């Protein structure tokens, strides 16, 4: 199940100021960027053009090139038409299709001031249940534009799935790539008196799915709290798993790492081991300004 | 239908001028354009509905107001000779945009040079009557300023359009002058038998647009207000 | 300008065909409209064009649109006199209430009448009230004659003007000349080219 | 609505003292998108800092990753200073290899 998304970020400071930046993700790999400082959509991968020829790309780029300018002015006129709502204004757009055979569900979500309010469904734009009522009038206006509504329908029903099926094969090499995680141990005072928070750092692994647990032999320590996936510049991932122990309970515990790149043979970092000791000695510091 | 008022106006530098527009079409959008040679219509102000008013491409000098769905005004608080133009008022979703009949505005530095037209009717020549069995009548409006005249021919109480043609453009009586007065000519051609009837009445009517009942006037001669000046001739048996 | 038109002004002999051009750079180009402007009146819509390649028709008028060429052509088949007007090409950038119309300078179409029997002459017409004041009428010449203005400042001459006697189906060209001053109708239109058989009646 | 930024400072590799590394600063959960982010060594703006393109997650909150080349030592302080409209004062979160 691969999810492809085009993310548009449009800001309006006033009547005379606006910028639009775009980014494009397949799974968790960035394929395209489009800065407000540039009249051309940029490839961030050697395979970002998909299975589309030069002529097919230039026509689609120009299609969007026309859209970026138009969108800006269309919004600015809607503001004047609602002049009820004032500047500054933030608009976000999320659009694309999910892959499953030939089946694919397409979407186009719109948020106004950081809250989801509009989506394109079937043949027209619609307001979300529990949305501002003043949004009806602009929606009524946007629907009277058959050409834009036809273009969107084309892009959602036909273009997205035919293009994304092209990318998935074009970048099969980078998607199936395997990167080995590296782990190192740490500890910090728990927020509770007499307690200690152990930390298992796990960095550099690709793809994303990973398993990290604290173990006493054959028993996974149920107090193991899995962290949030933090990105690295080389599109790999960092994650930490933490365990709260009473001072003294450190010994005999281990951090176990399961990742597809390791291929059976896990990483087992034991607390207090000669390796753990050697890693920690290479890490000492004056502790300013440690976290409160 | 898009109604405009007035259709013609003569104003002085630094005066207040309001051009009123109207439509009974239940339209949301309205526009104010001005038309100048070698340009094509340019947008000054527009609206999306009652209350709202927005700047177009050339709002400098002009303000706008929309109190109801029907009305839309263009307000020139301090008038300039550079605001001399023909003004059009449109309505509709830019789906069909409908346009107004237009307003000729002339703004002048001094109202002292404003003159009403002297009108003359010239009777057919016997040479034309003998040779063509047709008779042409020439009307001449002379010494008027600025060029804001509507000419019409009135045969026996009713206004005619057949056999008529009037100069599209007037002429300056002195080409080498900016404050030059204008002259305009017109023709009405009827059959010899029609002209030879003594009971047939012919009138040339020139509607002049000049000063209004508000504009101040001191110069010792007659005031050059908006008026109709007419000359006339009757048919002759010989 | 985002919209240009050619030619500046066009001249056609009544009954022949007339071809008008429009070229633009308006982005995006949703639709293109042609208007007609009778002298002293508003803009009346003739036709609208929607498709990338559109071929529309209405009455005598027929128009084509090519969006990839950003070009349009208005044809008038068998022109009438009452077709003498300014023709303006208008492009709408977006097909919604949020769009904005772009206008062209327009083409000034002038239709000259087909005079089958010319009868060139210059008559003198005396003022109704004052026998003294008089004018010169140059009338009934064929449409291949151009009227020139005076080199002498004291002499005023008007341009040609087509008049239609609807009931008799008779068209005629006419120019007027008058002078405050030596002036005689026989030599009023001396700057114009005068037909070899123009009738000059003796006063 | 204006949501305040969360700041997380971590390293791409295990912190070995005197061994060159890469320090990441990952700012999340903020809105609107306009934001100034600096990385500091001993309280001084680091000469060359690279930044990824700004994106946003499933709950419409913008996130952006800042990162620089750096060498951890026993006494050199590293931080991430962040100016955003939601805060009246910039937020400085120091690197804590132990956290
Ligand atoms: C989009 C999913 C498909 C994915 C496949 C693409 C793969 C390629 C990836 C390359 C990276 C591209 C960068 C990502 C871009 C972000 C995605 C944007 C998708 C939206 C596409 C919009 C359709 C384009 C139609 C368009 O240009 N349309 C413009 C011109 O249209 C004109 O001109 C048209 C063409 O000549 C014909 C039409 O008749 C005419 O009107 C319209 O002016 C655009 C306005 C529509 C957007 C409004 C949405 C706002 C929602 C309301 C929010 C409330 C806020 C208001 C309150 C103040
Ligand atoms: C696009 O797909 C929708 C369902 O998502 C369908 O209702 C609609 O008819 C389709 N339109 C076109 C033009 O294919």
Q: β-strand A115-121 against A104-112: which pairing, if any? A: antiparallel
Q: Which of C96, C99, C100, C102 to mutate to test the interface with A (most CBs of A within 10 A)?
A: C96
- If one counts every other C-beta atom within 10 angstroms of the C-beta of residue C95, the result is 20
Q: Give the list of residues 6+ apart from residue B133 with CB closer than 8 angstroms, or none.
A: B191, B192, B193
What residue owns the CA closest to ligand 2's atom 7?
A122
Looking at the DSSP bridge assignments, the partners of residue C9 are C108
Total number of domains in chain A: 2
Subunit contact A80:B52, Cβ cutoff 8 A: yes
> Left (φ > 0), alpha (ψ -120 to 50) or beta: where does C97 sit?
alpha
Subunit contact A285:D56, Cβ cutoff 8 A: no
CA distances A106 to A49, A131, A155, C48, Å, are 20, 22, 9, 35
Residue of C nearest to A79 (CA): C98
Residue of A nearest to C52 (CA): A147
Looking at the DSSP bridge assignments, the partners of residue A80 are none
Say if residue A44 is exposed, middle or buried (CB neighbours under 10 Å; 0-12, 13-18, 19+): middle
Domain borders along chain B are 1-109, 110-238
- Give CA–CA dist A134/A136, Å, rounded: 5
| Atom number of ligand 1 nearest to Cα A67 | 27
| Annotated binding residues of A | 74, 145-148
| Annotated binding residues of A for a D-galactosylceramide | 74, 145-148
- Give CA–CA dist B121/B234, Å, rounded: 10
A17 to chain C, minimum CA–CA distance in Å?
19
**Residue A201 lies inside a defined structural domain of this protein:** yes
Nearest one of A103, A140, A95 to A119, comparing CA atoms: A95
Is residue A159 within 8 A of residue A104, CB to CB? The reply is no
- Give CA–CA dist D98/A291, Å, rounded: 9
Is residue A148 within 8 A of residue A142, CB to CB? The reply is yes
Pocket probe for ligand 1: among A64, A143, A159, the residue whose CB has the most ligand atoms within 8 Å is A64
Describe the crossing of helices A136-143 and A146-154 by its angle, rounded to 10 degrees: 80
A27 and A55 inside one domain: yes
Is residue C178 within 8 A of residue B140, CB to CB? The reply is yes
- Give CA–CA dist B125/B111, Å, rounded: 40
| Binding-site residues, ligand 1, Cβ < 6 A | A 6, 8, 22, 24, 32, 34, 41, 60, 64, 66-67, 70-71, 74-75, 78-79, 82, 91, 93, 95-96, 110, 112, 118, 138, 142, 145, 147-148, 151-152, 155-156, 159-160, 163; C 28, 30, 94-96
B176: CA distance to ligand 1 center in Å?
57
Pocket probe for ligand 2: among A123, A150, A156, A159, the residue whose CB has the most ligand atoms within 8 Å is A123
**Alpha carbon of residue A99 to chain centroid:** 17
- Give CA–CA dist B103/A266, Å, rounded: 87
CATH code of residue A249:
2.60.40.10
A123: CA distance to ligand 1 center in Å?
14
Across C77-173, where does the E strand assignment appear? Answer: 85-92, 101-103, 107-112, 121-126, 134-139, 155-157, 163-165, 170-172
> Left (φ > 0), alpha (ψ -120 to 50) or beta: where does B103 sit?
beta
Q: Which of A87, A227, A285, A288 to mutate to test the interface with D (most CBs of D within 10 A)?
A: A285
Q: Where are the alpha helices (DSSP H) in chain B?
A: 126-132, 192-195
A131 and A62 inside one domain: yes
- If one counts every other C-beta atom within 10 angstroms of the C-beta of residue C37, the result is 19
A186 and A154 inside one domain: no
Is residue B123 within 8 A of residue C125, CB to CB? The reply is yes
Is residue B20 within 8 A of residue B4, CB to CB? The reply is yes
Q: Which chains touch D (3 or more CB pairs under 8 A)?
A: A
Three-state SS at D99 = coil
C-alpha distance across the termini of chain B, in Å: 50
Cis amide linkage into residue A92, ω under 30° from 0? no
Superfamily of the domain at C1-113: Immunoglobulins (2.60.40.10)
- If one counts every other C-beta atom within 10 angstroms of the C-beta of residue A283, the result is 18
**Residue A282 lies inside a defined structural domain of this protein:** no
A140 and A209 inside one domain: no
Radius of gyration of chain D (CA): 14
Radius of gyration of chain C (CA): 22
Q: Which of A9, A116, A286 sits opposite D33 (nearest CB)?
A: A9
A24 and A163 inside one domain: yes
| CATH of region B1-109 | 2.60.40.10
Is residue B234 within 8 A of residue B195, CB to CB? The reply is no
Nearest one of C59, C17, C1 to C34, comparing CA atoms: C59
- Domain B110-238 CATH assignment equals 2.60.40.10: yes
A74 and A110 inside one domain: yes
| Max intra-chain CA distance, chain C | 69
Nearest one of C127, C142, C151 to C174, comparing CA atoms: C142
CA distances A163 to A67, A99, A152, Å, are 19, 11, 15
Report yes or no on chains D and A touching (3+ CB pairs under 8 A): yes
Q: β-strand D6-11 against D21-30: which pairing, if any? A: antiparallel
Q: Give the list of residues 6+ apart from residue B115 with CB closer than 8 angstroms, or none.
A: B143, B144, B145, B181, B224
Pocket probe for ligand 2: among A153, A159, A162, the residue whose CB has the most ligand atoms within 8 Å is A153
C-alpha distance across the termini of chain D, in Å: 31
| Binding-site residues, ligand 2, Cβ < 6 A | A 122-123, 153, 157
C165 interaction partners in chain B (CB closer than 8 Å): 134, 162-163, 189
Domain borders along chain C are 1-113, 114-203
Method: X-ray
What is the DSSP secondary-structure string of A11-62?
EE-SSS-EEEEEEEEETTEEEEEE-TT-SSPEESSTTTTTT--HHHHHHHHH
- Give CA–CA dist C101/B93, Å, rounded: 10
Across chain B, where does the E strand assignment appear? Answer: 2-5, 8-12, 17-23, 30-35, 42-47, 54-55, 63-65, 71-76, 85-91, 98-99, 103-108, 118-122, 134-144, 149-155, 158-160, 164-166, 171-172, 182-191, 201-208, 227-234
Is residue D64 within 8 A of residue D24, CB to CB? The reply is no
Q: What is the resolution of this structure in A?
A: 2.8
Subunit contact C95:B162, Cβ cutoff 8 A: no
A127 and A214 inside one domain: no
A154 and A196 inside one domain: no
C42 to chain A, minimum CA–CA distance in Å?
27
Tell which CATH classification among 3.30.365.10, 3.50.50.100, 3.40.50.720, 2.60.40.10 matches the domain C114-203. Answer: 2.60.40.10
State which fold the D1-99 domain adopts: Immunoglobulin-like (2.60.40)
A145 to chain D, minimum CA–CA distance in Å?
27
- Give CA–CA dist B59/C185, Å, rounded: 52
Looking at the DSSP bridge assignments, the partners of residue B107 are B11
- Give CA–CA dist A152/A158, Å, rounded: 10
What residue owns the CA closest to ligand 2's atom 3?
A122
- Give CA–CA dist B174/C93, Å, rounded: 46
A16 to chain C, minimum CA–CA distance in Å?
18
- Give CA–CA dist B195/B134, Å, rounded: 9
Nearest one of A106, A93, A206, A235 to A164, comparing CA atoms: A106
In this structure, chain D runs to a length of 99
What residue owns the CA closest to ligand 2's atom 8?
A122
To which H or E segment does residue A278 belong? helix A274-281
Nearest one of A81, A95, A109, A78 to A12, comparing CA atoms: A78
Nearest one of A291, A277, A251 to D98, comparing CA atoms: A291
To which H or E segment does residue D69 belong? strand D62-70
Three-state SS at A168 = helix
Is residue A269 within 8 A of residue A276, CB to CB? The reply is yes
- Give CA–CA dist D96/D99, Å, rounded: 6
Nearest one of C27, C22, C169 to C106, comparing CA atoms: C22
- Give CA–CA dist A198/A190, Å, rounded: 9
Three-state SS at C187 = helix
Three-state SS at B114 = coil
User: Residue A139 is part of which domain span?
Assistant: 1-176
């Amino acid at each position: 199940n691969y999810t492809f998304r085009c993310l548009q970020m449009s800001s309006f400071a006033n009547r005379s100021w606006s910028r639009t930046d775009s980014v494009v993700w397949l799974g968790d790999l960035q394929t395209h960027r489009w800065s407000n400082d540039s009249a051309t959509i940029s490839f961030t991968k050697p395979w970002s053009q998909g299975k589309l020829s030069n002529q097919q790309w230039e026509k689609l780029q120009h299609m969007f090139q026309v859209y970026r300018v138009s969108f800006t002015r269309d919004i600015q006129e809607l503001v004047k038409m609602m002049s009820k709502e004032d500047y500054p204004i933030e608009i976000q757009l999320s659009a694309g299709c999910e892959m499953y055979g030939n089946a694919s569900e397409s979407f186009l979500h719109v948020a106004f001031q950081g809250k989801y309010v509009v989506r394109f469904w079937g043949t027209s734009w619609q307001t979300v249940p529990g949305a501002p009522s003043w949004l009806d009038l602009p929606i009524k206006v946007l629907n009277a534009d058959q050409g834009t509504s036809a273009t969107v329908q084309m892009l959602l029903n036909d273009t997205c799935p035919l293009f994304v099926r092209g990318l998935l094969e074009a970048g099969k090499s980078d998607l199936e790539k395997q990167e080995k995680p590296v782990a190192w141990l740490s500890s910090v005072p728990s927020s509770a008196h007499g307690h200690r928070q152990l930390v298992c750092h796990v960095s550099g692994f690709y793809p994303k799915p990973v398993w990290v647990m604290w173990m006493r032999g054959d028993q996974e320590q149920q107090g193991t709290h899995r962290g949030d996936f933090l990105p690295n510049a080389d599109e790999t991932w960092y994650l930490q798993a933490t365990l709260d122990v009473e001072a003294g309970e450190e010994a005999g515990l281990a951090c176990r790492v399961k990742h597809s790149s390791l291929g059976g043979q896990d990483i087992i970092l034991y607390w207090g081991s000669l390796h753990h000791i050697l890693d920690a000695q290479k890490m000492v510091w004056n502790h300013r300004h440690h976290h409160h | 239908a898009v109604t405009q008022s007035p259709r013609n106006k003569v104003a002085v530098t630094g005066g207040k001028v309001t051009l009123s527009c109207n439509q009974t079409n239940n339209h949301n959008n309205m526009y104010w354009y001005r038309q100048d040679t070698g340009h094509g219509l340019r947008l000054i102000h527009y609206s999306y509905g009652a209350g709202s008013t927005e700047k177009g491409d050339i709002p400098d000098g002009y303000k706008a107001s929309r109190p109801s769905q029907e009305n839309f005004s263009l307000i020139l608080e301090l008038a300039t000779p550079s605001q001399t133009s023909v003004y059009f008022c449109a309505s509709g979703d830019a789906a069909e945009q409908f346009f107004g009949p237009g307003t000729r505005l002339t703004v002048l530095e001094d109202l002292k040079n404003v003159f009403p037209p002297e009108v003359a009717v010239f009777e057919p020549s016997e040479a034309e009557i003998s040779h063509t069995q047709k008779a042409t009548l020439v009307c001449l409006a002379t010494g008027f300023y600025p060029d804001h005249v509507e000419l019409s021919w009135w045969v026996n109480g009713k206004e005619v359009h057949s056999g008529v043609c009037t100069d599209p453009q007037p002429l300056k009586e002195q080409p080498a002058l900016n404050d030059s007065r204008y002259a305009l000519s017109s023709r009405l051609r009827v059959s010899a038998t029609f002209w030879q009837n003594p009971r047939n009445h012919f009138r040339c009517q020139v509607q002049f647009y000049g000063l209004s009942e508000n504009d101040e006037w001191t110069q010792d001669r007659a005031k050059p207000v908006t008026q109709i000046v007419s000359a006339e001739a009757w048919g002759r048996a010989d | 300008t985002q919209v240009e038109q050619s030619p500046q002004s066009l001249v056609v002999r009544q009954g022949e065909n007339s071809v008008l051009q429009c070229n633009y750079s308006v982005t995006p180009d949703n639709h293109l409209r042609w208007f007609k402007q009778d002298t002293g009146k508003g803009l009346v819509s003739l036709t609208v064009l929607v498709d990338q390649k559109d071929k529309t028709s209405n009455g005598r008028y027929s128009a084509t649109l090519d969006k990839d060429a950003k070009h349009s052509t208005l044809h008038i088949t068998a022109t009438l006199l009452d077709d003498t007007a300014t023709y303006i090409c208008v492009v709408g950038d977006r097909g919604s209430a949020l769009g904005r119309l772009h206008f062209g300078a327009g083409t000034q179409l002038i239709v000259i009448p087909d005079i089958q029997n010319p009868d060139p002459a210059v008559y003198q017409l005396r003022d109704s009230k004052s026998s003294d004041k008089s004018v010169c009428l140059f009338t009934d010449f064929d449409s291949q004659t151009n009227v020139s203005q005076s080199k002498d400042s004291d002499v005023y001459i008007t341009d040609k003007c087509v008049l239609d006697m609807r009931s008799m189906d008779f068209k005629s060209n006419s120019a007027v000349a008058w002078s405050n001053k030596d002036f005689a109708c026989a030599n009023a239109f001396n700057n114009s080219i005068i037909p070899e058989d123009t009738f000059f009646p003796s006063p | 609505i204006q949501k305040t930024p969360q700041i997380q400072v971590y390293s791409r590799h295990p912190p070995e003292n005197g061994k060159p590394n890469i320090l990441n600063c990952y700012v999340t959960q903020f809105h609107p998108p306009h934001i100034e982010i600096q990385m500091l060594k001993n309280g001084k703006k680091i000469p060359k800092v690279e930044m990824s393109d700004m994106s946003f997650s499933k709950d419409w909150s913008f996130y952006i990753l800042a990162h620089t080349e750096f060498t951890p030592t026993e006494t050199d302080t590293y931080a991430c200073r962040v100016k955003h409209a939601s805060m009246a004062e910039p937020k400085t979160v120091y690197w804590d290899r132990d956290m």
